[PDB]
Design a protein around this ligand. Sequence first.
Ligand SMILES: O=C(O)c1ccc(-n2[nH]cc(-n3ccnn3)c2=O)nc1
Ligand SMILES: O=C(O)c1ccc(-n2[nH]cc(-n3ccnn3)c2=O)nc1
Ligand SMILES: O=C(O)c1ccc(-n2[nH]cc(-n3ccnn3)c2=O)nc1
Ligand SMILES: O=C(O)c1ccc(-n2[nH]cc(-n3ccnn3)c2=O)nc1
Ligand SMILES: O=C(O)c1ccc(-n2[nH]cc(-n3ccnn3)c2=O)nc1
Ligand SMILES: O=C(O)c1ccc(-n2[nH]cc(-n3ccnn3)c2=O)nc1
Ligand SMILES: [Mn+2]
Ligand SMILES: [Mn+2]
Ligand SMILES: [Mn+2]
Ligand SMILES: [Mn+2]
Ligand SMILES: [Mn+2]
Ligand SMILES: [Mn+2]
Lengths: 202, 215, 199, 199, 215, 202
Amino acid sequence: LPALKLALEYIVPCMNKHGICVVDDFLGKETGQQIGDEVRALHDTGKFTDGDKITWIEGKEPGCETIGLLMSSMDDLIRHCNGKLGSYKINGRTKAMVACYPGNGTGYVRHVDNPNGDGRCVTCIYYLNKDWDAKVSGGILRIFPEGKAQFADIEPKFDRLLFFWSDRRNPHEVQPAYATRYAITVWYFDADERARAKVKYL
Amino acid sequence: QTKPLPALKLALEYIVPCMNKHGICVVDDFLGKETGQQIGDEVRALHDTDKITWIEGKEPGCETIGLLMSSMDDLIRHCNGKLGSYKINGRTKAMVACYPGNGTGYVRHVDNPNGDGRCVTCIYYLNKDWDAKVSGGILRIFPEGKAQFADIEPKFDRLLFFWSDRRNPHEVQPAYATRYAITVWYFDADERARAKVKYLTGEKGVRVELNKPSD
Amino acid sequence: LPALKLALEYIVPCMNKHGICVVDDFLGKETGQQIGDEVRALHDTRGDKITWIEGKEPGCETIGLLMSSMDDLIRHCNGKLGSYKINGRTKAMVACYPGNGTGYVRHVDNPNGDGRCVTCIYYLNKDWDAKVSGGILRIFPEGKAQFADIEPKFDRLLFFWSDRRNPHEVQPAYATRYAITVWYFDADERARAKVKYLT
Amino acid sequence: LPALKLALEYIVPCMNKHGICVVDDFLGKETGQQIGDEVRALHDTRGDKITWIEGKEPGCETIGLLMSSMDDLIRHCNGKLGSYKINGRTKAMVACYPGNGTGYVRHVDNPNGDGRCVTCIYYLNKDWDAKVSGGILRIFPEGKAQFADIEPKFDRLLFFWSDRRNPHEVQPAYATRYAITVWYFDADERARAKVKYLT
Amino acid sequence: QTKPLPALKLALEYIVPCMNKHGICVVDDFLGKETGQQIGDEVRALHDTDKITWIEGKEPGCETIGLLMSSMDDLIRHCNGKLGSYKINGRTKAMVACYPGNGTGYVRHVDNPNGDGRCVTCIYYLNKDWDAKVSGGILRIFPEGKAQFADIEPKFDRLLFFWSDRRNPHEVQPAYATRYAITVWYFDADERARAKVKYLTGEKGVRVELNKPSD
Amino acid sequence: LPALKLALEYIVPCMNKHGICVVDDFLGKETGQQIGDEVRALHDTGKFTDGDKITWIEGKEPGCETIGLLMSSMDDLIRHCNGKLGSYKINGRTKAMVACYPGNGTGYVRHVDNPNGDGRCVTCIYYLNKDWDAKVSGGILRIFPEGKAQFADIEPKFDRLLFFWSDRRNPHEVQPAYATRYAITVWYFDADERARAKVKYL
Ligand SMILES: O=C(O)c1ccc(-n2[nH]cc(-n3ccnn3)c2=O)nc1
Ligand SMILES: O=C(O)c1ccc(-n2[nH]cc(-n3ccnn3)c2=O)nc1
Ligand SMILES: O=C(O)c1ccc(-n2[nH]cc(-n3ccnn3)c2=O)nc1
Ligand SMILES: O=C(O)c1ccc(-n2[nH]cc(-n3ccnn3)c2=O)nc1
Ligand SMILES: O=C(O)c1ccc(-n2[nH]cc(-n3ccnn3)c2=O)nc1
Ligand SMILES: O=C(O)c1ccc(-n2[nH]cc(-n3ccnn3)c2=O)nc1
Ligand SMILES: [Mn+2]
Ligand SMILES: [Mn+2]
Ligand SMILES: [Mn+2]
Ligand SMILES: [Mn+2]
Ligand SMILES: [Mn+2]
Ligand SMILES: [Mn+2]
């Protein structure tokens, strides 16, 4: 299951078909647990902006190589879909939103990542909660594809990667959880949208 | 053999009042393990011989399915005109459906919103030993104008009745294992007619010719 | 404009980009008046009245004309209209609405896939000021961040998808209203519909 | 923790920032058990059962105790609790829920301003695994982009606004459930309520 | 004088069946111009002597308002137990309300969702010569489980009846001129009782003392 | 009715009360019609980005002095509310979104200007449609204040200025219109929100 294959053979169609792509075992046990620890590190040192504990990583951070690995690893796959994903000309990506979600019975109401057209067109999420039994611990992502007669409960299973369109096509809510959960989110811009979105400023 | 079905008593003394009061009626241990597992096989067979398929009941390798349908009919028969104001004159084929276990769920919806004639939805679950607590697949019903709602388990050998119009909206929680169910809709004499008139059944129509004579 | 041009250069793209298409001055005040007269006369032989017309019936010639000219447009869009293979049609729903002060709740024509894929409406209300008598059709094209109010303008023709893509509500009217409606079936879908019924 | 500290240092701010406040280990497994026994015994003299308790009745002493200790918390929050002037209370709604597989539809306690401003619930279900038996209370704090699932944990006390600010639904239970509920009235509001009724 | 009111015929032959069938009933030219304009003055007077006020009917300068109420009662009286299954044993005071003309509207809502005893909302419009086409203020009702909805004009000397439970949700379009209306709710014997029991009326209560004896 | 008065005496309270402030006759007939023409100018020359004809003005544009007047005129009022409007520390503002709305029966579904927290906290709109009879031509703004039992239909009357919070508190839809209408929209940032919103990028 090589790199460009996953991209042009599974992602692109599965995405242009439904608008949701799941990828199990993206980096492997050892490589994943690595990030798994590397993220728990940041949970202590500080600089964690924003309960709702999140923080933004650029990849070249002090000692956060593996997070950078993951990021730069996703970049490949998205690059390998150039012009294939809808009419979207994808170029840049936000910094990695490494987030530690509370898990105290807290859930997040349904919403849309990019309803205004702020540029973000492909949400990309990585789950790193080792042995996160969603059957008991809960904390599942639920997506309601606009105009479809079905919906999907995606579990934050360990070492799972998830893609979906960020616009009004994918409204989604997150069932609450009872244990602490970690996850890394990333968005990708459409060259035109991200640009048009910038004429507002000075 | 099959479990004895006192269709008359079960209709008049239980199903009818239940339906009238609540609009939802469950009947467990409908055909017994013996017939149930059998239908299990019969349906898992058609898998070979989200996908569905329609059955009249006479098809080969579908004997017990036709049996199930005949039982459903047996129950609706002894209801008479007591089951709501509806006069049930007929029904659809049996929708034998294979639902996948990929964590897929079904949005809130209503079987018959347009008024196409269907008045009573009827479902039968044949999943041998299905723990809804483990695999999910629960069916959530919201009885219109009530302060409660109900999570019905797709328990093995369970039969489910409910009105199909705006009165019973429902969701289907995702399942994490393949699941099987047979659905049937009963028609109200009048509504089905006006439906056929209004072209809400897709049965009628008018041919559109390839061309017309100029002028 | 010829039917082919109107079809291929206007209707097909308008229907693909939006799923809603208006066509003003379809048959001209000349023929439109006759269609109107036929209908008004037809509905003299206070809720909403509807009588289905084949087109061949007496005193319903011009109605049939309208239907024919509709079918031609549909012929020119054959294959190019969405992803549908249209082979069927419904009788002309000649409908006389009350105009008392009651609108029709927001809904969708074909929610369960009964075969119908294109709703096609023709208005006959001469000098109908929507800002005075109302009866406006509000459509909410699913997905699009805008919505539209279509006025029952005389001699107006209106196409739109029948599925969940175009839910819509009718604003109340304060005067007698007339509108002929037809639906078109997708060859496959309508056939897939019949399957559930007994032989 | 003393009632005053718990009141002024925890409940008042928690109620102001959110309008929802949980308090675990309110009376301890010691007294909680007795409250439970009183209730369970009380409900032996399959839909949901409810019997209102004043607290003074026989075999309902400990219930009354719970009520008292609730009132004290309310006394310590006097004036500081939202913008309400609490002067009244309802009898203890001792409720036994079925646990058959039926939840209670999403709703709001006080939608028309009947006087009630604070819903206050105390759970008595020993060793109640919400992940096995369910019966969870899901609240949607209006305005906030999050929502919460409150587990009917034994000896748990739960405060929340009764108005449109906190709509909420109860997940179905798969075992017999017990929960005592009380509401508090805002002096003005409840008085403004009576006005509409005849002398 | 006032217009003759055949309360008996109007109740039995029109209002009752109308209500039962649709759940909404309008009665125009209820009291005639004479009494109508009078109530006009009577209410515009209380403005002096979004604001509201409650009236029993006996208040000075409210004679014709009490009259209006007595008429409403007259009509509901001759309904008997025919008006739904409800047994109307009483009602609220008359809510005389002054609605402002600042382009303010009222969200979709339901008078009695909790089940507080109110079963029938009753409204009377006294706006001398109000063109709803010009100033708006229309009341839109959505009869639960129906394919139509209705825009009721707050026409002068108009009386309006409808169920107050989940069956009749409604919106009020904004008005661009001051508007006046008198509302009244009738109680169902049973529901009001269970309501008083459930403390849904705010009437009952329990005193909370300033302090308690320590220990 | 001087400048700082309108600000601290009417805006701030009316805003902290409801979250919607209307101001009739902001610049006056002659001064308003001026913008009224100055905007119709741009409708021809070009450079109108984005039917839905809109364009972004910085105020110092060629010959667009009066638009700049309006912008710089609003700036005063918002400056005169420093720290008074909620807990919002307002600093910057987007470029003026001068928009020519179609008016062919087109309406805009209800929405929220800033549901994600992109910085914008105060929507400010100026209407310049001379004698725009909304009774006939229509095209009215309808706002549904979150948690309130009433809603408001604000007419785009000529020379009217409108303020409202942009976040989830003010969902709003626009009734369709039948004639061409022009309007100038502006947003204001909360120093903290606009800042936090920027950690995403690189
Ligand atoms: O900044 C934004 O627009 C923004 C950020 C995050 C976000 N999402 N989406 C799904 C999240 N999630 C939470 C737990 N599991 N998943 C989550 O946090 N959506 C939008
Ligand atoms: O064609 C129709 O009208 C139609 C089809 C399906 C359908 N439903 N609803 C809930 C179903 N389900 C799935 C699993 N367990 N239950 C199911 O099959 N209802 C109506
Ligand atoms: O059978 C159905 O579901 C069904 C039938 C008709 C219908 N339509 N369509 C357009 C209508 N209209 C336009 C102006 N006044 N009325 C109208 O009533 N929508 C749905
Ligand atoms: O009268 C009313 O509207 C009314 C009454 C009770 C009520 N609540 N509140 C908390 C309940 N609950 C908690 C766990 N199981 N049930 C519950 O049923 N909500 C509203
Ligand atoms: O207290 C209550 O339950 C209560 C109050 C008001 C109310 N409504 N509803 C529509 C009203 N209206 C306003 C103008 N024309 N009609 C009006 O007054 N309904 C119920
Ligand atoms: O870019 C954005 O997020 C954005 C831009 C504009 C916008 N709004 N709001 C009200 C508009 N309008 C239209 C007619 N009358 N008013 C309008 O255009 N909302 C959000
Ligand atoms: Mn998200
Ligand atoms: Mn269904
Ligand atoms: Mn329609
Ligand atoms: Mn409740
Ligand atoms: Mn009301
Ligand atoms: Mn906006």
